[PDB]
Design a binder for this molecule. Structure first.
Ligand code: AWI
Ligand code: AWI
Ligand code: MG
Ligand code: MG
Ligand code: ZN
Ligand code: ZN
Lengths: 323, 323
């Protein structure tokens, strides 16, 4: 049974990994085994002198702090965004662009980017005068919390996976990780995409055809959009994967709408299980958000992402056909 | 004692109120009595149906969360910033530009803008890997905390002074208070001043000279720079007041540098009691921060800021003469 899991983990470099199968085969540890597999694959334990027992201890604690009873924003989502970022990092247009530390920051940020998510939106937390929104002054409420939890767990017993980085390395990693996870706030998507478009239009490549990034502002912006694309990568995945992600977000949204009903609040878009249009909402989300984003990413790394974009377009056609 | 306290409060509309005297005479309650008085003077208990006992209960819980053993960032500084904002909101060049809710927000924000300050800077909190910096991801660490504490105290028994505001009024006040207090972060000073300068060069006034601000974006900017001015108003007060503020901030800075020294940390500027230049620092603070700010704000409110801007130049000349 560990033979089969090891077999499935040979796909870790491929888009459309069977992440739900890996979650089952690993005893509901997809985030630990996928992260561990990726750190080995990239030689990160050697490079940053990470004790393997420390890595496993932190990963299992981090994975524990995802809510097993949240339908979408759980440890499987975290594992999938981690793995999708890992693939995006390997794209030919980006070869040798990012340091080992920046690669570690992007992968770590993906792993923690939704930890302790309660299954309700920032807006719900603001409108219900939650303790989280009160702590964070209504501003990137969840994303600040994911960061705070993800860093705090490094301080538990035998959990500091960055114990052997230099002070300058830790300081630089911490800042990049914060910059990246804060960029997953969906209210920042339009400004983030507007900036990605500007970069594509003024794109510079090196003598080898690889993307040329002169400065932190450009490097972090690329990693911010990279993790944001991985976060919004479900509709680009093979359809059997995508449909299960849609089932899960809809279950999670419906539970929030029930709570909104239970309080006499207006029910949020897509949260009313009595007046739902699942297919129309996926087509809408692709047309106004996901495809504009992925088409701009595809341009930045052209033609590396052509197959991903073709799948997205087919999946949109399929959902559209069911209306 | 009661009778002389009331006579000092009669200067509540004057730049240079004897706030240390009021602190002495009120039993270390300057925040409460100055806030209470200003609410009367502006008719805010009537306009917003604030029960007088609720006002007092909250103001006293708030004042108790300012630290008595912090030399500068305590309840006297809070009371001083409140009263200073109260004065700047009466600048004839600002014609009741601001609604009554916009006035309530700027005064409430002033009162809470430093609550629970531990007497160390944001940078110290970041460098010591403090709980506060871990909570707030190194971004406006103290200012987020002041907001969160100031708002949370409204939930104590009989402390909700906004209980009779409408739901929309509460939502608008909360956003404005957050926007103002976040702008007291000193790392945002330069951008904030840049924006005040732009507002000055494309300023628009009546023939009577009074300022015309049409969109929320510019009106919140004025209130941000206003409370910022009130926070940085010590060098514009009568010299007997300003010198006391200088003594207190240097004591607080020196205590931070003593905590930095015994920890083995690099001692922050102006925090080394064995190598300080108190008067040079004040002159440099005026030349680079306080005068540019108040010179841009005097332009904005011409001629209303001349007496203030005059005191600042007098005080800068005096400090320079002690060198
Ligand atoms: C335009 O408003 C919409 C929207 O409009 C079209 C309306 C029908 C007319 C549809 C949406 O559909 C979704 C479908 C999803 C998922 C979603 O993502 C949640 C998310 C939250 C936080 N971080 C990361 C992700 C959403 C949306 O958020 C979402 C939003 C909000 C977006 C924005 C404010 C920028 C996630 C996974 C899958 C892909 C399985 O389904
Ligand atoms: C240029 O950097 C300087 C600086 O250099 C120029 C001089 C050559 C050395 C000198 C400074 O001297 C001060 C003297 C003070 C007070 C101060 O304000 C503390 C504060 C912290 C947090 N919130 C609000 C306020 C400061 C400074 O902050 C400060 C800064 C940092 C500011 C900025 C980066 C924008 C407060 C009260 C009084 C007026 C009594 O004295
Ligand atoms: Mg998220
Ligand atoms: Mg402050
Ligand atoms: Zn996510
Ligand atoms: Zn202050």
């Amino acid at each position: 049974q560990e033979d089969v899991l090891a077999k499935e983990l040979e796909d870790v470099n491929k888009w459309g990994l069977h992440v739900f199968r890996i979650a089952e085969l690993s005893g509901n540890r997809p985030l630990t085994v996928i992260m561990h597999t990726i750190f080995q694959e990239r030689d990160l334990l050697k490079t940053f002198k990470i004790p393997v027992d420390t890595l496993i201890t932190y990963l299992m604690t981090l994975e524990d702090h995802y809510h097993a009873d949240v339908a979408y924003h759980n440890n499987i989502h975290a594992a999938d965004v981690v793995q999708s970022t890992h693939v995006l990092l390997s794209t030919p247009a980006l070869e040798a662009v990012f340091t080992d530390l920046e690669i570690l920051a992007a992968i770590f940020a993906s792993a923690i980017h939704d930890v302790d998510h309660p299954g309700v939106s920032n807006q719900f937390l603001i409108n219900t005068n939650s303790e989280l929104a009160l702590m964070y002054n209504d501003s990137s409420v969840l994303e600040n919390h994911h960061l705070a939890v993800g860093f705090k767990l490094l301080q538990e017993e035998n959990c500091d996976i960055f114990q052997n980085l230099t002070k300058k390395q830790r300081q630089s990693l911490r800042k990049m990780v914060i910059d990246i996870v804060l960029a997953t706030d969906m209210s920042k998507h339009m400004n983030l995409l507007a900036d990605l478009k500007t970069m594509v239009e003024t794109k510079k490549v090196t003598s080898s055809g690889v993307l040329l990034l002169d400065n932190y502002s450009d490097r972090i912006q690329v990693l911010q959009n990279m993790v944001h694309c991985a976060d919004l990568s479900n509709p680009t995945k093979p359809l059997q994967l995508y449909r299960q992600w849609t089932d899960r977000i809809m279950e999670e949204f419906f539970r929030q709408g029930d709570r909104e009903r239970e309080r006499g609040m207006e029910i949020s878009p897509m949260c009313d299980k009595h007046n739902a249009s699942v297919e129309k909402s996926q087509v809408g989300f692709i047309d106004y958000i996901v495809h504009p984003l992925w088409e701009t990413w595809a341009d930045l790394v052209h033609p590396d992402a052509q197959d991903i974009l073709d799948t997205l377009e087919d999946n949109r056609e399929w959902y559209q056909s069911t209306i």
